[PDB]
Amino acid sequence: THHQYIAGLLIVGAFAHGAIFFIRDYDPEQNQDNVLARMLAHKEAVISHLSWVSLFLGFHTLGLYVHNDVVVAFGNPEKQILIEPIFAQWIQATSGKMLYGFQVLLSSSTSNASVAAQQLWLPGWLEAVNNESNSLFLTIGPGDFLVHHAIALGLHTTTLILVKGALDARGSKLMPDKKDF
Amino acid sequence: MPSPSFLGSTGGWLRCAETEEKYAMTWSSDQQHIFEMPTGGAAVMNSGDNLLYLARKEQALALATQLRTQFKIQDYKIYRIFPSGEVQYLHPKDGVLPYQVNKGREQVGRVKSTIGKNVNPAQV
Numbered sequence: 001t002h003h004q005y006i007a008g009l010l011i012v013g014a015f016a017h018g019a020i021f022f023i024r025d026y027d028p029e030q031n032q033d034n035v036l037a038r039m040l041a042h043k044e045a046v047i048s049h050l051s052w053v054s055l056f057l058g059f060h061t062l063g064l065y066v067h068n069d070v071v072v073a074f075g076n077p078e079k080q081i082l083i084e085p086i087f088a089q090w091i092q093a094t095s096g097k098m099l100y101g102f103q104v105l106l107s108s109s110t111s112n113a114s115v116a117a118q119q120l121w122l123p124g125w126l127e128a129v130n131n132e133s134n135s136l137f138l139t140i141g142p143g144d145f146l147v148h149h150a151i152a153l154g155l156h157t158t159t160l161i162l163v164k165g166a167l168d169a170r171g172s173k174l175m176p177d178k179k180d181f
Numbered sequence: 182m183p184s185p186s187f188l189g190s191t192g193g194w195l196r197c198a199e200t201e202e203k204y205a206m207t208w209s210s211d212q213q214h215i216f217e218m219p220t221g222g223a224a225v226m227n228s229g230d231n232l233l234y235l236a237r238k239e240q241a242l243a244l245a246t247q248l249r250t251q252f253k254i255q256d257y258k259i260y261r262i263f264p265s266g267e268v269q270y271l272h273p274k275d276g277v278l279p280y281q282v283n284k285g286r287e288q289v290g291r292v293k294s295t296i297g298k299n300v301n302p303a304q305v
């Protein structure tokens with residue numbers, strides 16, 4: 001979490017100085033005709049998509065959460081609309097397990113894709129992931145998915161907030177002389 | 182000069198007011214009236230001109246704005262400097278600022294586009 005918080009810091013520092021670059025160093029007269037100047041001639045469409053994502057991942061992540069709490073409070077945890085991240089379960093299938101049997105990656109040691117480069121280091125791979133005592137690709141399920149859904153929600157919202165502040169830095173409709181300060 | 186009497190202290194006997202420039206207003210006051218200071222309660226306005234002390238410029242202009250709405254009286258405000266320099270900063274033209282005057286001039290005026298271009302081609 002130490003390096004995690006400092007990672008978020010460096011991200012914000014990069015984007016803040018990017019906004020300063022657009023204010024004190026950008027010039028539409030020189031960078032014209034490329035793709036960078038073409039961005040902020042139509043950037044409103046990009047801001048629209050990002051706002052839509054921020055609303056979508058909210059009404060469903062937190063909406064699922066409210067359903068979970070309300071139906072568990074009523075004494076029916078089974079009526080709860082549970083969720084299974086089969087995409088994140090596929091990561092566990094990639095670990096070389098040969099007992100799955102539903103045409104997933106690394107489910108059979110005879111497949112040429114699995115046979116390719118399984119001569120030396122794969123024996124340790126399969127032995128290291130087929131354990132409940134290590135932290136090499138843990139089990140993933142509902143309480144594991146819905147938080148990743150929430151992380152996507154918060155991170156996409158954060159992305160929009162960090163980008164639009166640098167986009168509407170020279171001016172906006174509320175204030176087009178923002179560059180004059 | 183006969184000035185309205187006010188009680189409550191607060192305004193007077195401030196060191197900062199003594200070391201800082203002070204404002205002095207006046208008004209005709211053809212009739213005995215009762216008004217309110219911008220920083221005090223109520224006080225009776227005596228006949229003839231009345232000189233007061235003010236510590237802020239906005240305080241010196243809001244009182245003139247309030248007097249103009251009551252009755253129709255010309256206002257005079259004089260702004261003194263720290264040592265003893267007394268200059269007429271209010272109505273240097275003696276013509277009301279919103280109304281048109283003959284003595285015209287331009288100070289700090291850039292005549293360029295509206296999005297920006299903050300460079301000034303000429304200060305005077």
Ligand SMILES: CC1=C(/C=C/C(C)=C\C=CC(/C)=C/C=C/C=C(C)/C=C/C=C(C)/C=C/C2=C(C)CCCC2(C)C)C(C)(C)CCC1
Pocket residue numbers: 014015017018019021022163166
């Ligand atoms: C705003 C601003 C700025 C900044 C920006 C930025 C910083 C951005 C970013 C971003 C980011 C931060 C990104 C990231 C990324 C990544 C990517 C984009 C990738 C990719 C791809 C792929 C496809 C992959 C694949 C793979 C491989 C390779 C192997 C393994 C597996 C996988 C799948 C992963 C500037 C200053 C400029 C300007 C102004 C302001």
